[PDB]
Ligand binder design. Sequence first.
Ligand SMILES: Cc1ncc(C[n+]2csc(CCOP(=O)(O)OP(=O)(O)O)c2C)c(N)n1
Ligand SMILES: Cc1ncc(C[n+]2csc(CCOP(=O)(O)OP(=O)(O)O)c2C)c(N)n1
Ligand SMILES: [Mg+2]
Ligand SMILES: [Mg+2]
Lengths: 666, 666
Amino acid sequence: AATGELLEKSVNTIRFLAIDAVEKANSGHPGLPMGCAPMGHVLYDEVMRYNPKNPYWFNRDRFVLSAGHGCMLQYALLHLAGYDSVKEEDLKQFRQWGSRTPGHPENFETPGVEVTTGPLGQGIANAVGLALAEKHLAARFNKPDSEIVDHYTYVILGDGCQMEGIANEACSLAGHWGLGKLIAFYDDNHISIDGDTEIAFTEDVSTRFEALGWHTIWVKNGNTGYDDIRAAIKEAKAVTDKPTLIKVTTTIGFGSPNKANSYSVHGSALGAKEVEATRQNLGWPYDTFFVPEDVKSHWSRHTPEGAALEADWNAKFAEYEKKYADDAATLKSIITGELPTGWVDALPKYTPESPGDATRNLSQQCLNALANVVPGLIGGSADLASSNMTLLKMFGDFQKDTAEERNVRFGVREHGMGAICNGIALHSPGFVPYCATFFVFTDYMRGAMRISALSEAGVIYVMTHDSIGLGEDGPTHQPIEHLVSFRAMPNILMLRPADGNETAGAYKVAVLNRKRPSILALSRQKLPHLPGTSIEGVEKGGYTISDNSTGNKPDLIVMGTGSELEIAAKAADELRKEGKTVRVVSFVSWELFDEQSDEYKESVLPAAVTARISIEAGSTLGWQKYVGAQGKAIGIDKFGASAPAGTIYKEYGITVESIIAAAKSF
Amino acid sequence: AATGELLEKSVNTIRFLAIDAVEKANSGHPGLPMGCAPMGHVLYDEVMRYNPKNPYWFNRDRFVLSAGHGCMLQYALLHLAGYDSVKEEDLKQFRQWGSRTPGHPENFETPGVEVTTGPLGQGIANAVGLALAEKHLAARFNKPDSEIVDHYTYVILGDGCQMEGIANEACSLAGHWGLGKLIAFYDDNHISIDGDTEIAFTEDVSTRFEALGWHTIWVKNGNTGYDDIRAAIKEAKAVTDKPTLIKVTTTIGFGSPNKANSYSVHGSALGAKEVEATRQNLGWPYDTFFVPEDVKSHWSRHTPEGAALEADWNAKFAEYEKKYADDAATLKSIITGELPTGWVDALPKYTPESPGDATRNLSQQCLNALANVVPGLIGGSADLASSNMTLLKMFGDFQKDTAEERNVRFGVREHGMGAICNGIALHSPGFVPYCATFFVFTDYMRGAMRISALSEAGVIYVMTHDSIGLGEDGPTHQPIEHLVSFRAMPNILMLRPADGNETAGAYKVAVLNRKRPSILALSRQKLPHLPGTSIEGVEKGGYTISDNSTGNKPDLIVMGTGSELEIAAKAADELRKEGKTVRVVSFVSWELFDEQSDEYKESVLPAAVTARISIEAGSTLGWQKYVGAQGKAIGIDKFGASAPAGTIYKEYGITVESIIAAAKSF
Ligand SMILES: Cc1ncc(C[n+]2csc(CCOP(=O)(O)OP(=O)(O)O)c2C)c(N)n1
Ligand SMILES: Cc1ncc(C[n+]2csc(CCOP(=O)(O)OP(=O)(O)O)c2C)c(N)n1
Ligand SMILES: [Mg+2]
Ligand SMILES: [Mg+2]
């Protein structure tokens, strides 16, 4: 470990890389990096196990910056540690077009960044997920003679993250689950954007954490108390049954004579005068982006030492694989992301002779089938297991003493649940996390869902009670705008399966899509199995299920999704008996349809056919793209009602009579 | 107060109204009402001041059921208390089409219900807002000799609300603000839908509440400890400096011999055999929906006593008006919802001599102008005051010791902030609450925003940094799907003003809309004032700002919103110089445009004109409604980038050259 002047110079190297990167961009956040440089130095230089030349090493300790605005702290540390993703020139292209150093940390841009933060509270909730993943894999795979899984999860969070509901949700679960390898550093700097925290944040954070089942430590001088930081981390490792909150009191902008300890230093460049004053105050004669030779030499040891650490773990994995071949192959699937051969064949098959069932129940059949062939399938419901139908019946519950189990019981914590699942997904590429609530409550967890899409986290969102079909719970519970609100969102599938074959298809797509989250909108109510539904169809997003036309010139195209596809099918039957040629199209995914060839699109929605009807129990917005200038979208552009679902469908005109009336009107 | 057998019969009347209403609907939640009947009886029969024949009486105590699924508790109590909104026939139409007894409590269906709950956590956050409103009005208007504002806010919440992030956010603020008249009853029944709370919820809730700055009491026998409940409420009311959490341990489904104390009784009808077993166990001979004549006689006193309470307060208000005329007129305005005459004339006006500015700054000008003329304007930012530009410069901050002030500092608590503002809006109809964050973080607070729309709460959502225009903070911060995600949501305006006149117009609409929330998407970056923008235009949602066409047959229509309207205007200038006729249309609100006459719509978007272009820095989804299949929507259907905003606009093709290219292609 560095001592005396070398330690001071190393900590200031981190401060000035942040200051100088922010100054060059004339954009970003120097305050947090200046105050957090001491704990950042101790974490990357002394405590964390990693190989800086292999950011993908399975058994690395994981670091998350929940206060993502402070990203120049992490970029400085990744640079000094020898990560290939943060060269000197990447620091010089902070916040610049297409750089590896974006203004908030992005796993998809910067190998060595574990998750995407910037939206406050996501990172601490992600760290709960990363620690769940480690605890599960250790319980599931470790043997008396092979501790093949053993790593810590370290997270830096500030006052903003500590005010966000998502952080209280995830930290309640971390305490409940006894995640003893989760070690959180609270940057206790008494500053947020509005200024002193006294303006809006006077709670006793440490006592709240004790109440949540956490171990708490207070480091009163985080600016210069290196030994206190080191002793806090050692005490944290000694407490194996509870997550640890190390409250570290720092000065934001430590070393700035004129901007330290003020909102001034949170979120803008120091400027020329204050950069010079800070250099003079800290005693930093060095040029911009300068790493002193002695600091360079000190940090250089992480490359050989990190290679040696990973080699030690590789030898342990080889011995594990020799003695426990089956368990090693199962773990290797979670590590590599290579899904076992033939996994798709586990999915259930249906015909129109299969009895009708709700897609929430058909979803449970798919989850249970997949659990046997997808080793990384893990997850569950926010307190709605018996309504969302999420239980893997061959497994018990994930708990402190049963972490090997694969049902995760999130309680009434949708937002925390989503960010925990992002952490599981981004732990190892063979994780397939799923989580569930009523579809309407995606609104509670939408911040985490958007970050699934941005961070390429393949979370499966199992969202039941997808419409007015749920009935009596009424308009507070009935989605309307939700489908289109996700159709608009980049990099997320909005799947709305009609029946058994479409639900199996939606799950095949969701499991294959390890870099894009999938939402499945699933019915409360029972639906028939329809002639012509197929997995192959779902993979194309929009596909024909019935057609009595010739020349690719149906008199009418009726398109539907989910529970409304049977209404389209029944209307088509009645219209065909009157001598009309009708094509019925399933739009189970707009996103996958849009990805298809021009020739495929023409085969389903011929340009010459203008007589087009859509039916879906939700917003009509965006359906005009598929029903066109002459067509009619049947839907709901108002809130729902508290009544038996049958009554709502009739009153809202979500009926075969509405389709027949629209067909007459062309 | 009821004693002995009369008390038992009154409490059981509440239990059996709930049981029998749920049984008739074969739908709903008997568990919470059966467990909570004792505390509900004490609250409505003994503690709360109200007039059952005037649900609007300003100085009534407020009750909120945060655990809204338990709504038959409140419907039973409103019925027994003599509210005109809940007669015997209304109880018989529980969860039936269009009834006054929907499956969750809805202020917009049922006078006597203060707010809309059902989405867990909203109600407790609403109660923080109702108590803020009382504390603000008391500090602002009370005099040493006239305590004219004096009422309590009572809220019942369960394990679900206590797990939700929004509840921790709002309760942190309640403790910070010293809301001593906020009294919360935690239904501590150790059950949620997944069963015993031990599955996912083992935190020490009461100690967390102490850490949040709350006074705590524990009633260990909530089933039969009537004196313990009464003493807890007396102690709570006597603690003036802190909100009180009364943890009330109950049995869910108390009195059901076979379903008490289980998830079974949470959320479905008892069924015939268990209804009879419950009648036998509790000793209830009475027919369905029957209120014993002794219970009827006891409760009848609330009609004359409630009229007398309101009459006493009216005499107090008349004496206040006599002695403090100007303060009485201002408070009366907030009570009645009459906005002062001429308030619209306070809004700023802009001409070709006005300097260009960001709509975030123009928004601050409108807020400051309105603060002088709209007595109920109150609110602020989630820790972004100096970036959202929300400070009312003539006022200080709302705090425990300065509750008269009108700047509310929410900290990093978007979801809590939204639900607090729903509480303020629904306290008194002259309140005009506003709140703010970056537009992208609407996702954090979307559950409360949707309830603004459903509950007809006129909250003004001031949402700055509306696009890639914000630049370097990057894709975590840059809205894409957000505008269309709110266009699809019923009963909410999605306003996107281009300049000074449009920002003034958006604020006029937002203030007038006391029954529909308004979102204003506001720019980080400076924009010009565009000739042809007007308040009158904003009121119509979609309107022409420039036109050199004749016969309502422009060669080209270019439409834009916000920061992209100047791009449309510049493109139109270039095209008109070539001899083309071009109409430029502002779509500041889709919603208001859609409300206009067929004749008005035809006057702006003539059916004969197919050459139509839209430009907006966000999703293109839904623009085909206005541009048509033959038109072109210029936008962004991918995530943003971390770069100077100018670079992003160029790379993403949000340019006059894109409009010119689209115009060439027709
Ligand atoms: C969900 C969310 N809301 C708001 C913001 C805007 N924001 C950026 S950092 C910050 C607060 C800064 O406080 P703290 O977390 O204490 O950081 P410090 O200034 O101490 O470094 C806010 C409000 C955000 N990034 N995410
Ligand atoms: C935000 C949100 N998520 C999920 C639900 C679905 N839900 C309804 S009640 C409930 C929990 C019930 O537990 P509790 O609040 O403890 O009520 P109790 O069963 O004791 O009456 C859940 C998860 C909801 N209504 N709101
Ligand atoms: Mg801080
Ligand atoms: Mg409960």
